[PDB]
PDB file of C-alpha atoms in Angstrom:
ATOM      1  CA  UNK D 236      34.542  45.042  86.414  1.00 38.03           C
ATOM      2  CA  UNK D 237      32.020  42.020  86.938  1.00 35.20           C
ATOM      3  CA  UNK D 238      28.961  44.533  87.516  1.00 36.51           C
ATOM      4  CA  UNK D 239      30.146  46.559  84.451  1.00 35.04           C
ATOM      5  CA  UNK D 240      30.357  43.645  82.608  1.00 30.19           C
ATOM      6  CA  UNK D 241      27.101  42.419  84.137  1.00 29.79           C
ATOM      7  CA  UNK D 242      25.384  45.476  83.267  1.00 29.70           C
ATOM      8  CA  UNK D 243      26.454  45.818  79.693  1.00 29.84           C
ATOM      9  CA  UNK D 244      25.707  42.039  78.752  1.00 31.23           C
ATOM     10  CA  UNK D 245      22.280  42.238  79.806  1.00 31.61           C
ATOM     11  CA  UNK D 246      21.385  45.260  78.217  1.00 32.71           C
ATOM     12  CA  UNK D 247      22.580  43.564  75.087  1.00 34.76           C
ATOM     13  CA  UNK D 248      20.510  40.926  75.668  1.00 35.70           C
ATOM     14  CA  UNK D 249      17.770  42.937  76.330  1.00 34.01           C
ATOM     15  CA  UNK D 250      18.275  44.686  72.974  1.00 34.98           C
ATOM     16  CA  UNK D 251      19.073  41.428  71.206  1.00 32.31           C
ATOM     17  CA  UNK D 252      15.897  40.087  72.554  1.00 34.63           C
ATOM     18  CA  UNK D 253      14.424  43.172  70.953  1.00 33.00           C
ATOM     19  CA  UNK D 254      15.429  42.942  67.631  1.00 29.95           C
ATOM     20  CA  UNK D 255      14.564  39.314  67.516  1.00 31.27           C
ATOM     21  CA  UNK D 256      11.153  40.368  68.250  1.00 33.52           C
ATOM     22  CA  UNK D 257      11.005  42.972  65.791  1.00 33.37           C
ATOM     23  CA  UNK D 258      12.594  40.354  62.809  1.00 34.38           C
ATOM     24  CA  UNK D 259       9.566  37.942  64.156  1.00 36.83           C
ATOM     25  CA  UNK D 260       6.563  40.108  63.705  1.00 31.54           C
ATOM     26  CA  UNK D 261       7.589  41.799  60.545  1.00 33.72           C
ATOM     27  CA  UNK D 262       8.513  38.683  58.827  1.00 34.72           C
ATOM     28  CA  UNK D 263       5.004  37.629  60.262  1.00 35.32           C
ATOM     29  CA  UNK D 264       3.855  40.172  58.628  1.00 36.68           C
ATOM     30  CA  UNK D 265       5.282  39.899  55.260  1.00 33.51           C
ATOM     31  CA  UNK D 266       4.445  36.273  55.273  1.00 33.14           C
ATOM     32  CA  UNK D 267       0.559  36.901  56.271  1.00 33.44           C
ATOM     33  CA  UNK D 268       0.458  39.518  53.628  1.00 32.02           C
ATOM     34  CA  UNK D 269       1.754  37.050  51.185  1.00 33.56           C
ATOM     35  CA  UNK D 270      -0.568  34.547  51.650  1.00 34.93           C
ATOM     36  CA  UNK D 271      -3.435  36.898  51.505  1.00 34.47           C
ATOM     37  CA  UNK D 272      -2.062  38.340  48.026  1.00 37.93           C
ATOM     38  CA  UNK D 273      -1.706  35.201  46.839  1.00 36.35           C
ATOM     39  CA  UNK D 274      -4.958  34.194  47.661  1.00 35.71           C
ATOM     40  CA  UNK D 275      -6.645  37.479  45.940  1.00 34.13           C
ATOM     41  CA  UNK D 276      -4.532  36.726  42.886  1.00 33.26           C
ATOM     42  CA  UNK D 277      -5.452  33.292  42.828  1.00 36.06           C
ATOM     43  CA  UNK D 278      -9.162  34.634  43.187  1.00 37.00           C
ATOM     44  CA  UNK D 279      -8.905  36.996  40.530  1.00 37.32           C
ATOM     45  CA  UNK D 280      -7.542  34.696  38.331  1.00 34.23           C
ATOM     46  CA  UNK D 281     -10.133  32.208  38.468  1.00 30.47           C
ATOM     47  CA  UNK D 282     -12.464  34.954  37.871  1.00 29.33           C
ATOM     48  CA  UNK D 283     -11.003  36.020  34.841  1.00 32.06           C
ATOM     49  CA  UNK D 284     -10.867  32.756  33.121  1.00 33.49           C
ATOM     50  CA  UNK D 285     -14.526  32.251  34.391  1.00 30.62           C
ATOM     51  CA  UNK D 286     -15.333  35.135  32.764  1.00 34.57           C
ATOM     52  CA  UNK D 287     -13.205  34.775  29.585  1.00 30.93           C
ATOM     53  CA  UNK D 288     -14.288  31.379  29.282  1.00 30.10           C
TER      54      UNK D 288
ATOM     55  CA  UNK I 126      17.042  31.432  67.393  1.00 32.37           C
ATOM     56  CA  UNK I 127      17.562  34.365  65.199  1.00 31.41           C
ATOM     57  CA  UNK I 128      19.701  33.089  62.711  1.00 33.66           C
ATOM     58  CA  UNK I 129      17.786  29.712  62.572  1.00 33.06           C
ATOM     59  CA  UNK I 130      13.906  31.941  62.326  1.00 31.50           C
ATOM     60  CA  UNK I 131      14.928  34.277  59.876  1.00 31.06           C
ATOM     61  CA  UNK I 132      16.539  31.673  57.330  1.00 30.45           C
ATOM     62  CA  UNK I 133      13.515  29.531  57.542  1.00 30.85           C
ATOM     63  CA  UNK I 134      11.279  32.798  57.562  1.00 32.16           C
ATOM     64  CA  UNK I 135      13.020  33.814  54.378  1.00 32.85           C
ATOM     65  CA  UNK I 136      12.634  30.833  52.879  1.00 33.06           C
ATOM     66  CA  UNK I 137       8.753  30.627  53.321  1.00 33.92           C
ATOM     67  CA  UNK I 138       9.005  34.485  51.906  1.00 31.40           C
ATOM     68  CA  UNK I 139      10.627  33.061  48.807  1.00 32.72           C
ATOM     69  CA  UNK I 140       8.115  30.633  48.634  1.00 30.93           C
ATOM     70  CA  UNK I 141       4.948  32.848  48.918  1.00 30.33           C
ATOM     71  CA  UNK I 142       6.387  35.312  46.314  1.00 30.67           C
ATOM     72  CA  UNK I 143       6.848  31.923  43.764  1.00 32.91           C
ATOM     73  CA  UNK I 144       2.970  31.548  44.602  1.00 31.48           C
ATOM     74  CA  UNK I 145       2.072  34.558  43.615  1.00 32.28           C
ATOM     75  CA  UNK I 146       3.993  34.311  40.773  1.00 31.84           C
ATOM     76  CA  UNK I 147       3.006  31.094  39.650  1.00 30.98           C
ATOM     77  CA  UNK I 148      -0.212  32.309  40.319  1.00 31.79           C
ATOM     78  CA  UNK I 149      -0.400  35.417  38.163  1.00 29.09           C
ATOM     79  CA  UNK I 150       1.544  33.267  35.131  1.00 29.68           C
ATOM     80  CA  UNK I 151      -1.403  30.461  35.247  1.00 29.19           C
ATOM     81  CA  UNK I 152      -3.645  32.949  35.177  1.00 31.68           C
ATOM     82  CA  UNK I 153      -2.248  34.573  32.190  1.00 34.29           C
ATOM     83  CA  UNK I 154      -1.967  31.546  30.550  1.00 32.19           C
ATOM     84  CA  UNK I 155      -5.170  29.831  30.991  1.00 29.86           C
ATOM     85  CA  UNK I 156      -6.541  32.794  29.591  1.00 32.11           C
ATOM     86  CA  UNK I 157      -4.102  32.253  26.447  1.00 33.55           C
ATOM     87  CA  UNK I 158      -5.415  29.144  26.067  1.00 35.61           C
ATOM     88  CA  UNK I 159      -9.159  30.072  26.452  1.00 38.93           C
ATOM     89  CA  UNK I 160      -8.790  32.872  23.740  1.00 41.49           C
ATOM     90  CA  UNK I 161      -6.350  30.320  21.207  1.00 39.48           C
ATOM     91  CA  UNK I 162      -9.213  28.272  21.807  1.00 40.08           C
ATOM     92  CA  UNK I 163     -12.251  30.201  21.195  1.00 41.26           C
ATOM     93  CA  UNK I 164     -10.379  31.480  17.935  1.00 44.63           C
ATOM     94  CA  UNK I 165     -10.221  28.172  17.012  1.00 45.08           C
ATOM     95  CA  UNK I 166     -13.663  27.107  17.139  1.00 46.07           C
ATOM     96  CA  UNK I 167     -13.872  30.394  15.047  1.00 43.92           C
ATOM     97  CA  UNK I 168     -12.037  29.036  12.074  1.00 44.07           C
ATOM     98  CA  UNK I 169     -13.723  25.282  12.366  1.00 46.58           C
ATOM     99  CA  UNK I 170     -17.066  27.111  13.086  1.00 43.24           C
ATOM    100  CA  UNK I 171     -16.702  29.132   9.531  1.00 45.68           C
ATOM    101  CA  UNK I 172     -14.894  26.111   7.919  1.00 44.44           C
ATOM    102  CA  UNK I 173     -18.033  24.415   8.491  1.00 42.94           C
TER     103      UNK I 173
END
């Protein structure tokens, strides 16, 4: 029972450990893309009122 | 570690899409106030 037990916890872990990885780099992501989209916006915007102005 | 990284990940997510936001709505407004603006040298301008 301890080596079944054994065995099944650390595959969990394993796959736990896996989807914290995957939550890491796509929020990563998502808050890299944000910053760059906020930055073009930001950008754009002063190039509008430039332009309007 | 999980629960603890994705709160404060969400958090900074909520906080780059309020940029943006903010962003965009300054934009849009400072351009409001350059065309009110312009129109209103308009009227003084023919006033005058």
């Amino acid at each position: 029972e301890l080596y079944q037990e054994i065995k099944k916890l650390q595959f969990d872990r394993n796959q736990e450990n896996k989807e914290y990885d995957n939550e890491q780099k796509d929020t990563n992501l998502k808050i890299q893309n944000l910053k760059e989209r906020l930055l073009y916006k930001k950008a754009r915007a002063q190039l509008k009122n430039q332009y309007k102005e | 570690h999980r629960q603890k990284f994705s709160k404060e990940k969400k958090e900074e997510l909520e906080k780059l899409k309020n940029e943006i936001a903010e962003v965009k709505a300054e934009k849009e407004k400072k351009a409001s106030q350059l065309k009110n603006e312009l129109d209103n040298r308009l009227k003084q301008l023919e006033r005058d």
